Every structure is written in structure tokens, then in C-alpha cells.
Amino acid sequence: MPHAFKPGDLVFAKMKGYPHWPARIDDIADGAVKPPPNKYPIFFFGTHETAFLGPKDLFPYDKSKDKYGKPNKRKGFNEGLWEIQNNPHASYS
Structure with missing residues (x-):
């Protein structure tokens, strides 16, 4: 059964x-700008x-x-x- 969304989850947005x-x-880095409530x-x-989106716009990959x-x-x-298929958890800084 589904959980809420969490950092690391892969989606189409x-x-x-x-x-x-x-x-x-x-993730949100220490000291970095937080998303509005209910957004990710x-x-x-x-x-x-990066953009901030709620679950309605998030489809599990x-x-x-x-x-x-x-x-x-x-x-x-x-x-x-x-990227999503081959190295979805990499740093892309």
C-alpha cells in the first residue's frame, strides 16, 4: 500500500x-529554502x-x-x- 511522497522517490512531474x-x-539541504506547506x-x-509541486502533479515513475x-x-x-533510468540518485549540481 502507498506511503506519502518522500525524498528519493522517482516520478513524472x-x-x-x-x-x-x-x-x-x-531533499532540502540544511540552510536551504523550504517549499510552501503541502508542496515538495x-x-x-x-x-x-527545481519547482515546488503538490501530489496532484506527481505520478510514481x-x-x-x-x-x-x-x-x-x-x-x-x-x-x-x-538520468531517471540510469542514475536517478546522483548529484547533478
């Missing part, structure tokens, strides 16, 4: 005007950007990959696919 995008739930820090693979994990024209996307 949905943002307006973008396809469901490979991403992870990030989402690290988008390939682009390496395993369940969703068949639908969402196909190549896309958009910048960063196919790099993102490689």
Missing part, C-alpha cells in the same frame, strides 16, 4: 504547458531545474513509465529519461 516530465522528490521540491531530470517515458522533442527531456 506535471507542469502547465509541459509533458509529464522525469523527476525526483529532492521537485528536481526535473535533464533540465536540472514505476506505474507511469509505460505511458510517459518515451522520447520527446522538448529540451532536456531525453537526457532526463536517461
Whole structure:
């Protein structure tokens, strides 16, 4: 049975005007900016950007990959696919 989202979880994350995008739930570093209540820090693979999102926009990677994990024209996307599949827990600083 499902838990709440936690740092390290892999997802496709949905943002307006973008396809469901490979991403992870990030940690918040000591001293770093916290997300608003009920939001999570989402690290988008390939682009390496962060946005804050609630669960409605977060689809677990395993369940969703068949639908969402196909190549896309958009910048960063196919790099993102490689990352989530091959080294999703790496530092991308």
C-alpha cells in the first residue's frame, strides 16, 4: 500500500504547458529554502531545474513509465529519461 511522497522517490512531474516530465522528490539541504506547506521540491531530470509541486502533479515513475517515458522533442527531456533510468540518485549540481 502507498506511503506519502518522500525524498528519493522517482516520478513524472506535471507542469502547465509541459509533458509529464522525469523527476525526483529532492531533499532540502540544511540552510536551504523550504517549499510552501503541502508542496515538495521537485528536481526535473535533464533540465536540472527545481519547482515546488503538490501530489496532484506527481505520478510514481514505476506505474507511469509505460505511458510517459518515451522520447520527446522538448529540451532536456531525453537526457532526463536517461538520468531517471540510469542514475536517478546522483548529484547533478
